[PDB]
Amino acid sequence: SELAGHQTSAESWGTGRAVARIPRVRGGGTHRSGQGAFGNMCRGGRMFAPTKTWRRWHRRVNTTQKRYAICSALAASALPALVMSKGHRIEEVPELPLVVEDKVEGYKKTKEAVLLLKKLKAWNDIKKVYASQRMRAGKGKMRNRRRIQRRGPCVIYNEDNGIVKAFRNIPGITLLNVTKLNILKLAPGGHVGRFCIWTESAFRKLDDLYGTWRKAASLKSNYNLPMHKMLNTDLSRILKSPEIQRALRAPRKKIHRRVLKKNPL
């Protein structure tokens, strides 16, 4: 409150009365009389630099960068090492990316959804979300944040014909409309490599949504994939190649430690 600590008529007694010069409450007959006020070192006073509602809570991020961030997330989502390293149990999914037929877009019952995840071997990831359900340490419990769990697989669909309702009650699952992908969902916590599951229709719109290298995006007015700074990231193939290996001087791997000086005299 802009009033916190200021709803009094406190006034400094001045010097000469053998007390600090902090402004003091007026009147008498109660405990509050003669106590310190206002200052941030006082009990019941006004804090230092009171917080303001016009703190700059919101940030602009360039569209070109936000789209970049969605391409990085999708690229990372297709590498087993990164999806494993994100904690997902995808040790038995048949392939990455995992593309399922468009029939799953029309499911209605949660049991159809649970059964599919068990046949795709995405159910060990669900069971890890159940095992990670627990209480939150700290005041978040007092503030409608009592329970915490880890994110599960992400299900990406082209059109919702009951897939959202068929999946929404399974803990950890997040649905995403392929034409409205979100970085906060594809990279929870800021870390790339969330395990995702595509329907066929969703998987076939990615080229249109973000364009290939040869063909600009069709569903974005002017966009194309971000160019590669380094085309061959296999540093070991590059270094071991004959061409580089002919230009190098022989390695100097002999270690010349310090010689203890003995007196020639």
Binding site: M142, N144, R168
Partner: protein, 134 residues
């Protein structure tokens, strides 16, 4: 997950409305499940506990198979008093212990005109949803 914009899941709002519930609401809150026999017969799962019902205690120190009659629905304290569910004070007199209605099972319902009206409505609503899934 809850989607109704006008239903709060706030912890403190929900607790204030529980502990300040008016009597006719505390009644609904003070509901008990039915035995497997009663559940099958009436196609109802839970009933608002009432005086002269006969219940089993299924949790706590006084749990067991002893069927006792409900002798008092102390709504202010959110507890019911049951026959033989009691103990002694220092001076040796006997005093009832308060069991929460949610920790008993109703084995016989004190039936009258209004209880039957309540029972039929709950089953009629249940059967409607049954035929919605079919």
């Amino acid at each position: 997950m809850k989607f109704n914009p006008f239903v709060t899941s706030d912890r403190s709002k929900n607790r204030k409305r529980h502990f300040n519930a008016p009597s006719h609401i505390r009644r609904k809150i003070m509901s008990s499940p039915l035995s497997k026999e009663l559940r099958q017969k009436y196609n109802v799962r839970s009933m608002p506990i009432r005086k002269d019902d006969e219940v089993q205690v299924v949790r706590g120190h006084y749990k067991g198979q002893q069927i006792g009659k409900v002798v008092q629905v102390y709504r202010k304290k959110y507890v019911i008093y049951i026959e033989r569910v009691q103990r002694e004070k220092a001076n040796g007199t006997t005093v009832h212990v308060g069991i929460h209605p949610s920790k008993v099972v109703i084995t016989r319902l004190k039936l009258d005109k209004d209880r039957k009206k309540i029972l039929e409505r709950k089953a009629k609503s249940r059967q409607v949803g049954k035929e919605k899934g079919k």
